[PDB]
Amino acid sequence: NSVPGAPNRVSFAKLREPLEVPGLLDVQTDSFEWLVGSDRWRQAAIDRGEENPVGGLEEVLAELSPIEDFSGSMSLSFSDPRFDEVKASVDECKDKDMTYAAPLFVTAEFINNNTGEIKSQTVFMGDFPMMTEKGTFIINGTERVVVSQLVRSPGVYFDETIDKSTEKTLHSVKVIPGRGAWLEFDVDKRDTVGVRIDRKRRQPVTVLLKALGWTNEQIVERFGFSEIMMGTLEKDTTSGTDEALLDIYRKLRPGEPPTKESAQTLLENLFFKEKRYDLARVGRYKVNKKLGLNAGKPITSSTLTEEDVVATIEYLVRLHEGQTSMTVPGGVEVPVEVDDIDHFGNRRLRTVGELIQNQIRVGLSRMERVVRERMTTQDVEAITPQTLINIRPVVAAIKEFFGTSQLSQFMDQNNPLSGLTHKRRLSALGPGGLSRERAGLEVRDVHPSHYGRMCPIETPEGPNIGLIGSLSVYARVNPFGFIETPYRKVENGVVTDQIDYLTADEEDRHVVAQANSPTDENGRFTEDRVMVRKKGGEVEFVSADQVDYMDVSPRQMVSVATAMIPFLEHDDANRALMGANMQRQAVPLVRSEAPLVGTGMELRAAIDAGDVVVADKTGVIEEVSADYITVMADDGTRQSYRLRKFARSNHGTCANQRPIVDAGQRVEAGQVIADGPCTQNGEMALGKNLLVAIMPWEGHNYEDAIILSNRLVEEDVLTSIHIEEHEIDARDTKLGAEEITRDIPNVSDEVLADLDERGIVRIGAEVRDGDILVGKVTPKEVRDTSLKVPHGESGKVIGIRVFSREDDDELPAGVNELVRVYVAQKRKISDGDKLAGRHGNKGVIGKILPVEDMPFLPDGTPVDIILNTHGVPRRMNIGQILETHLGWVAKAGWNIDVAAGVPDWASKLPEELYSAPADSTVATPVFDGAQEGELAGLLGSTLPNRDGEVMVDADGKSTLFDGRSGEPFPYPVTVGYMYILKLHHLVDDKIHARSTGPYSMITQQPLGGKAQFGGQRFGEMECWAMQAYGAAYTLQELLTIKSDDTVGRVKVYEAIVKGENIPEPGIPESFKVLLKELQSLCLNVEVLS
């Protein structure tokens, strides 16, 4: 029906969804296809609204074009962009650090006014990076992402501000174009109304009025009814504006020859022309939607404006007293409100397309200056397009952006969900936004307009709690960047199948209902009073016809990772936040097992993430294998798919793809063919289902720790593969040149026994700290400097990749060769490692118990994991309990006794749930899932085991035994199947030690970091906590002969290894520095005694 290869995953849902989950990463692709005027977006735009659908590049090349010098004689102009075919595929770019891009062309034309000539040729503007089917730009071998960015929308924004001395509310103004005249009107502390242009000294506001060529009569005509007028009208200023304009000017650029024409041109150029005034269509539209200007009229070219500047002062005055509505003499009627900074009708989204557009704009401005110079300096008849173009600035800008900009981020490539959330991530920090000022509680909080646009739960936990969210599922983006969420229209009390993608400026004006508002049939409601939202997020119990719109589903405000947590609504926002943020840092496992009790949003999350290899045209599998697949479509063609086996991600994890098909199997476009790292048949599997008991054991699950069974180490259940990439570079130096050889100065052969006749380890080797991965030699006759495995690493090699300059590879400049070895480790679960379910129930293993000593059901089933009771209630993560019970049911299926009649609790249950087999997946969506009454009578059925017995009660509990004492347990105990995850918080990456290693060379302190064999930091709080005891020799140690004292450390090491008693410190290096730094100021610190 909806998806072909959909393993039967029963649904406890009761409502009917009139909208399928849109393309979960369609925002990135749509924005790009808008940045390159692609044809699909062309048809999209034409089919809806405008019929001249300009792209995003053409807008740049046009707003700039034409171009000419000051003398105007000769001009130039671009047109007709166009794209070539990519030079290399994706994996073909990865395997050699190449880049994914396409040659970009242009069609420029030069002309001369005296000759009236035309030379129009196509130019080449480099290699334009490009987006894949996933949403990731590739940059020099790596897979990258370009996240969105929340910013303010250009347009008037008003805000009352109370003087902290005299508590008198006075309003204000600010016209905030994309660039140009930065400005703010206001009601001054006096009745007068001053301005502040260019963010500078204030002046009257009638001044600027009569500056445009106006008079006091028309002013008092169109507005003379507010006192603030007289205050600023009684200035006794020369009505002929000849100086105050020149005064403003002389304030701008002190030292100018004075002229009325000068100030005239400055005012008409800095506020009313593209030079330094351009309300990008978003801003002109924000100022049109408000004040009701030019209603129902195109918006192409009204950035500059002589009327959008005059109605703003009217808004401000009429808001002073509170005139609750307005109307332009020719426009529409709009209210008089104030403007919030977070309201999404005032914020907007700088999608990737717009960032790239802007960097291209900058590069083209640099090229513009270049050609201005070449054109007012070079002689005519020798300059035509290929000579009037220096592209390097453009390419350099694009690469600078894609390399440095904090928005050009590596792909969070732990698991498909991590990557899929790194896309759709809304980042309110970056070039153009806030970084220092608003890092408080006015942007790090939730707003009622975040309903269907951002998930109030999913947000990183580090420094960016609130500055980084995650776009929701049923959401899209206006061409203008304003986010949109769908809503079902409703009229007279009968719901409809119509759907409108509204934005907050079109929703606060209306009344929206809720999803669960029941409806009998045909579209009619069931009650007379329902629940609704309103303008200021004020929920209400209100009538059934007053409504005007209606939601489209539950889970409309939640993100993806939050729409995968079952029984979420039974949790607390903080623990759901933890769970969301702890599914992203889950490591792929060897065998991915689908979730027994899950949520419907588990298939799309892998179809729409680019880690499953799907078909493209209904057909027949023809040839199968581990690496390659060969389809034979029913159209005549033969599609061939290639699987990436054992590919290191950007975090260390594997990417093993395996096929789920056989030979001859019919398929259907969209039907999965091969799973990914964390998928089973097409649905996201991040961890495993485990038999759970909930009970305090003999002191090993104390304080959030937990227990496991050695079975999870025999059967390789929670086993995970980790891959590491070491490398070196062979280059030149002063003493000659670097080489990569097996010849090693003065060593034994046990070392080299694993290497080959070239210097690199033989694939299939077994290495460890102290093993030569590649033999390099550095001159001076030579130096012993090869590559060696660090402390704590070990495993078997997989790949050796040697890129050589002698064989035409785009290596760096000071380089002759580049060698990259890949090693791998099959790490098992172990003490210290971290685990967590989906409801923030995290914990580090503290024991691993022999199966023979684990509490076992009478059937012998030895429980695997043992949680604790004292962690559920005081945290409000009760959902897991339910996830537990249902799990058991889903494992040992049920058959409701309908022989008599469907019990009252199974009334709302839909058919296909009255019966099920054993080990049967399920789906309990978030806010339309299995309530607590359809579950406290489901456990009853709970089909028995093979021996006919039920190993569970009607409450979810069993009568466990003990493996050590043998005796049973007195009271019944909870038991079930809970889905846990493995995290990247492994001890093998966290343990760190040091006795004597490398130092700073600048402060003479042990270095900091396991990455570089560093030491631990003995801060100030620790100094205090020591002084409090009375320990003065230990502190002397930790400050002198362990950090700074340069001879003490070595004398101490040596005395120790000799058995002697260690000496006392000398003088630290910090004090020495202090003394020989004071002496620099001609202060004589003379010690005494």
Binding site: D445, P448, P456, G466, Q514, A515, H570, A573, N574, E932
Partner: protein
């Protein structure tokens, strides 16, 4: 807010009884750090 949450974590929260429970959560997860900061301030002073 005069619109309370008449539903528990067992009976199951609704949506809008769940979109107003976040505000304070984020507020607190941000306030914790400022609390630690003011504590460190008082402590460094009392030690001075």
């Amino acid at each position: 807010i005069p619109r309370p949450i008449k539903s528990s974590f067992r009976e199951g929260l609704t949506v809008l009884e769940y979109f107003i429970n976040t505000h304070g959560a984020r507020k607190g997860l941000a306030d914790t750090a400022l609390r630690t900061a003011d504590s460190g301030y008082l402590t460094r002073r009392l030690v001075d």
